[PDB]
Amino acid sequence: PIETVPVKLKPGMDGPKVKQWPLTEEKIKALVEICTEMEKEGKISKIGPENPYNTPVFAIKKKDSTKWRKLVDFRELNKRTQDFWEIPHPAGLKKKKSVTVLDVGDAYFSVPLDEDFRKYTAFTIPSINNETPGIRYQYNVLPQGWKGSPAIFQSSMTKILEPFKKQNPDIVIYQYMDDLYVGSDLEIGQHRTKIEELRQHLLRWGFLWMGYELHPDKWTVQPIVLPEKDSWTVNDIQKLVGKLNWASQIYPGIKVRQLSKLLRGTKALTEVIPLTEEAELELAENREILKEPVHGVYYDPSKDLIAEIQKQGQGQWTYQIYQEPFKNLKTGKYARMAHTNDVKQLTEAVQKITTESIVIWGKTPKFKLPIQKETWETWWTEYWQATWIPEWEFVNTPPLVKLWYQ
Amino acid sequence: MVPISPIETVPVKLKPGMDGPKVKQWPLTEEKIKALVEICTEMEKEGKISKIGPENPYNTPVFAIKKKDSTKWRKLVDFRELNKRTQDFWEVQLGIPHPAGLKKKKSVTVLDVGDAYFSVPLDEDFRKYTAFTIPSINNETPGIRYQYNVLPQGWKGSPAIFQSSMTKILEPFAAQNPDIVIYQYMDDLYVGSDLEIGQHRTKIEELRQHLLRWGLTTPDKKHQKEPPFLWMGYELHPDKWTVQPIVDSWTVNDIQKLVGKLNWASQIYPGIKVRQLSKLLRGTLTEVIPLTEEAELELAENREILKEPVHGVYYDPSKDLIAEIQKQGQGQWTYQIYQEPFKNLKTGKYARMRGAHTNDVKQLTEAVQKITTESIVIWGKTPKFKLPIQKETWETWWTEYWQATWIPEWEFVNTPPLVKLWYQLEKEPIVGAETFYVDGAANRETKLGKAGYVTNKGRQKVVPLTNTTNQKTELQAIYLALQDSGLEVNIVTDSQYALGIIQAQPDKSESELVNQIIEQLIKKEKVYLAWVPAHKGIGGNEDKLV
Numbered sequence: 047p048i049e050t051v052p053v054k055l056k057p058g059m060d061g062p063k064v065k066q067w068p069l070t071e072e073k074i075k076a077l078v079e080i081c082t083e084m085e086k087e088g089k090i091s092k093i094g095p096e097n098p099y100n101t102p103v104f105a106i107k108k109k110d111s112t113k114w115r116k117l118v119d120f121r122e123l124n125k126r127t128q129d130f131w132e133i134p135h136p137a138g139l140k141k142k143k144s145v146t147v148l149d150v151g152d153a154y155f156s157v158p159l160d161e162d163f164r165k166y167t168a169f170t171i172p173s174i175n176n177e178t179p180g181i182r183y184q185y186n187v188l189p190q191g192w193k194g195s196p197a198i199f200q201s202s203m204t205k206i207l208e209p210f211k212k213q214n215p216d217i218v219i220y221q222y223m224d225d226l227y228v229g230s231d232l233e234i235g236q237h238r239t240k241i242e243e244l245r246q247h248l249l250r251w252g253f254l255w256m257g258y259e260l261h262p263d264k265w266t267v268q269p270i271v272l273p274e275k276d277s278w279t280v281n282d283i284q285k286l287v288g289k290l291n292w293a294s295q296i297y298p299g300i301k302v303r304q305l306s307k308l309l310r311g312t313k314a315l316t317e318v319i320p321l322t323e324e325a326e327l328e329l330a331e332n333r334e335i336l337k338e339p340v341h342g343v344y345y346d347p348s349k350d351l352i353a354e355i356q357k358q359g360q361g362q363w364t365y366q367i368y369q370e371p372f373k374n375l376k377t378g379k380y381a382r383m384a385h386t387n388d389v390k391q392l393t394e395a396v397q398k399i400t401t402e403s404i405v406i407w408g409k410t411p412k413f414k415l416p417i418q419k420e421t422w423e424t425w426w427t428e429y430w431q432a433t434w435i436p437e438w439e440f441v442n443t444p445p446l447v448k449l450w451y452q
Numbered sequence: 453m454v455p456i457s458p459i460e461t462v463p464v465k466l467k468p469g470m471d472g473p474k475v476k477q478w479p480l481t482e483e484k485i486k487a488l489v490e491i492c493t494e495m496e497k498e499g500k501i502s503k504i505g506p507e508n509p510y511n512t513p514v515f516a517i518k519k520k521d522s523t524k525w526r527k528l529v530d531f532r533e534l535n536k537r538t539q540d541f542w543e544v545q546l547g548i549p550h551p552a553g554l555k556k557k558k559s560v561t562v563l564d565v566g567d568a569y570f571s572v573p574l575d576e577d578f579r580k581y582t583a584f585t586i587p588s589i590n591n592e593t594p595g596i597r598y599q600y601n602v603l604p605q606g607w608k609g610s611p612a613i614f615q616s617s618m619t620k621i622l623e624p625f626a627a628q629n630p631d632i633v634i635y636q637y638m639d640d641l642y643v644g645s646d647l648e649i650g651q652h653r654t655k656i657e658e659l660r661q662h663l664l665r666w667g668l669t670t671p672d673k674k675h676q677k678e679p680p681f682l683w684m685g686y687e688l689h690p691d692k693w694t695v696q697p698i699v700d701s702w703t704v705n706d707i708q709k710l711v712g713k714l715n716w717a718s719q720i721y722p723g724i725k726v727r728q729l730s731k732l733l734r735g736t737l738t739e740v741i742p743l744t745e746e747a748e749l750e751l752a753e754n755r756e757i758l759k760e761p762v763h764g765v766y767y768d769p770s771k772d773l774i775a776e777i778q779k780q781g782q783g784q785w786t787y788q789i790y791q792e793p794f795k796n797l798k799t800g801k802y803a804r805m806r807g808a809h810t811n812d813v814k815q816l817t818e819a820v821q822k823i824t825t826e827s828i829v830i831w832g833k834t835p836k837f838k839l840p841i842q843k844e845t846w847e848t849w850w851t852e853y854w855q856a857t858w859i860p861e862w863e864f865v866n867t868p869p870l871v872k873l874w875y876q877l878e879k880e881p882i883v884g885a886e887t888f889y890v891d892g893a894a895n896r897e898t899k900l901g902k903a904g905y906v907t908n909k910g911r912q913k914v915v916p917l918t919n920t921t922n923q924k925t926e927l928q929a930i931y932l933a934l935q936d937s938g939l940e941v942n943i944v945t946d947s948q949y950a951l952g953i954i955q956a957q958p959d960k961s962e963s964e965l966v967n968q969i970i971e972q973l974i975k976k977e978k979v980y981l982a983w984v985p986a987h988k989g990i991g992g993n994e995d996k997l998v
């Protein structure tokens with residue numbers, strides 16, 4: 047065990063030097079209490095000015111607990127960490143009727159780290175108003191949030207649950223960062239039980255008490271639906287034509303001209319138009335096209351997953367995951383009943399989408415958030431609750447395609 | 453002799469691949485050579501330096517500088533080449549405390565510790581790359597070589613290493629004197645205690661001994677520097693703080709540096725305006741650019757504003773913390789942060805970003821986040837806001853805005869000009885309103901095109917236009933329908949561009965066509981704007997492309 051698995055960066059890169067950002071006084075207090083046992087347990091140790099490396103750090107509440115937990119934004123070290131090429135995605139996991147997420151990075155801390163690399167895991171607890179220099183630190187053990195911390199423990203971990211999953215050759219087990227995704231075809235009771243069993247089985251070799259329940263969705267890509275009316279106003283047809291024209295980029299074979307013929311003429315917008323026999327037929331063929339899924343849409347593990355999110359109003363949010371535009375791998379809608387805080391809702395939605403994305407492909411996506419950078423930058427860490435963090439960017443033009451995903 | 457505890461060296465290396473420095477010792481004057489030997493012999497006496505033999509290939513130059521009228525000379529070493537090759541360090545003084553962030557204390561002592569710079573060892577392994585040679589007289593004797601045993605004055609490593617060690621010593625003293633508060637900026641210490649000036653005065657003693665236990669010199673008499681402390685361009689007083697008053701051919705320097713100067717004054721001076729001059733900087737380095745007889749209008753409330761001297765107070769953690777915002781016009785916002793009325797902790801302004809269009813409600817939101825971020829820096833909490841916007845206005849805005857958005861806890865303050873929503877598009881077609889199908893088009897060569905509409909009542913118009921583009925004409929066509937329609941109107945466009953502009957709800961724009969539409973929307977009761985795909989022969993989709 048004493049051997050520390052050697053690690054390096056990818057050729058020709060320096061370790062992270064990222065500004066720590068301001069933290070509120072109560073989160074500073076919490077990281078103080080937290081980071082005082084982490085030294086007393088040798089998990090971290092103080093450093094001096096010889097170390098210029100720096101990785102941001104802050105504090106969260108995880109689910110249904112008032113105990114502050116600490117996160118490090120390993121995003122710049124994780125893209126500078128060696129490939130760690132030294133785990134074909136469990137496609138069984140995305141089909142299981144239930145899947146529970148278990149926190150396992152609570153025990154990454156029992157293994158040391160190559161003395162040469164700790165310098166790259168450097169962070170600062172910050173002080174209010176710059177009154178004191180920051181409390182700097184470095185990791186001695188394997189840190190939660192590091193891209194190498196599952197890779198290094200993947201050997202020890204397979205021997206951990208080797209008794210399990212030889213008893214239960216159906217329950218699919220997956221692992222991403224500090225999370226263990228265990229999925230079952232068993233019914234809710236049978237899953238809720240085999241869960242508690244795999245819990246204590248972790249204790250013998252050991253925030254493990256927390257877990258999530260998540261079940262699959264009927265449609266990976268939800269269908270595009272056209273209205274079913276007995277009378278159509280000009281406005282109704284105008285929206286219909288606009289939506290079928292948009293769907294023509296995804297589903298070629300969509301024809302609109304017989305519907306457009308009913309529009310010619312300067313009729314008032316609220317006037318009912320009777321549909322012609324031609325137009326009624328064209329609407330019918332157009333449905334049949336939309337009943338089939340989009341054809342020849344394949345995932346590509348080399349490529350990046352893009353996620354787009356629209357705010358719909360009334361706590362509803364629609365999203366789409368794709369690599370190439372108009373070829374969605376998944377599409378979905380998250381709703382509610384906050385309802386005062388748009389940003390709270392958005393950051394949960396980004397969280398749900400990322401977790402789904404870990405269950406399906408085992409890699410998180412890149413978001414295009416309908417939010418202003420400075421606003422999102424200010425508040426997201428107040429609602430974030432996952433031990434990982436995707437990448438993101440910001441959408442500053444109102445896409446007119448929001449209602450078409452309504 | 454009482455043994456001084458030793459100061460652990462800091463492991464220091466150079467940049468990888470770069471071996472180190474070698475610099476030609478400059479030809480000096482015999483006076484300068486006679487002077488420099490005196491210092492080094494006295495420095496060697498102290499242990500600050502040591503002679504080095506013929507095994508060191510790294511040379512750092514050393515010249516001499518007389519102390520102005522003072523007859524005593526002073527030696528300088530240019531490690532500028534050792535610095536270009538020295539390793540990287542963690543700097544921590546990347547930001548200056550803000551006076552408004554300090555808690556009021558009965559007593560406050562300032563101790564200079566810049567002396568101990570040289571009381572701090574050096575990594576013996578690195579004492580070599582710092583090495584200098586003193587030119588012998590007449591170049592007839594082998595030159596004298598020397599190295600440093602302590603952090604040299606010009607070495608890039610010396611600040612960061614001093615501060616790290618200096619912190620390490622102080623941690624036990626502060627843990628055992630919780631009744632005091634120590635702050636360390638850069639070679640300075642700032643002790644503050646709500647204690648009887650007698651008890652406080654002796655805990656300053658204890659501290660100097662603690663630092664002496666490690667061999668750190670520090671002043672006892674003539675260290676008071678009693679308030680007013682002159683510090684980082686402020687004047688701090690026991691109950692109040694302020695800024696040290698700092699200073700035809702309006703040279704670009706009268707603009708390039710005066711920008712940050714007037715901004716500096718506006719952390720406590722309310723209503724300091726610095727925008728018209730920022731336009732004068734343009735994208736320029738030497739020019740007496742005009743005052744536009746409009747930028748000088750701010751000086752009549754700027755130079756007249758620095759007359760009545762303004763003070764801020766220190767922070768009290770027990771009261772609430774409150775920020776209030778005023779719209780100043782021209783994308784300008786001011787705020788005050790305070791705990792009791794008119795006793796400001798500090799003030800500020802918010803500069804609008806470079807938008808093509810924009811509205812007040814977005815400008816306000818950004819000002820809120822900026823104040824939010826600054827307050828967390830300075831106090832570790834967000835203030836409660838007083839904002840000139842009705843709650844109704846805020847609800848309608850955020851609930852119908854297509855982006856996510858949020859303001860922390862806040863209240864309506866009814867100082868005008870209030871921030872309002874100027875117009876509001878309908879969600880559904882308006883029964884009984886005339887329907888204008890508008891269209892516009894231009895020719896990429898001639899810059900010539902038409903703009904007009906056709907309606908369900910047979911109303912029609914086409915205007916021809918010179919020197920124009922498809923985007924201008926699509927907008928003009930909407931503008932035509934707004935002028936010629938009544939108080940309630942349904943508009944159909946094929947312009948995705950025109951929609952994008954209006955679905956962002958500007959209330960001011962750089963394009964004067966956009967402002968005329970906006971001004972038309974304001975006079976309307978109900979406007980429904982509907983998009984359709986172009987070239988699908990839809991209803992009255994055009995006449996405007998001839």
Ligand SMILES: C=CC(=O)N(C)CCOc1cc(Cl)ccc1Oc1cc(Cl)cc(C#N)c1
Binds near residue numbers: 549642682
């Ligand atoms: C009653 C006097 C008075 O000046 N105050 C109450 C202001 C609060 O000053 C301190 C509050 C505390 Cl808690 C510790 C140290 C403080 O003195 C500082 C802090 C700094 Cl950054 C710089 C300097 C300098 N020069 C002094």
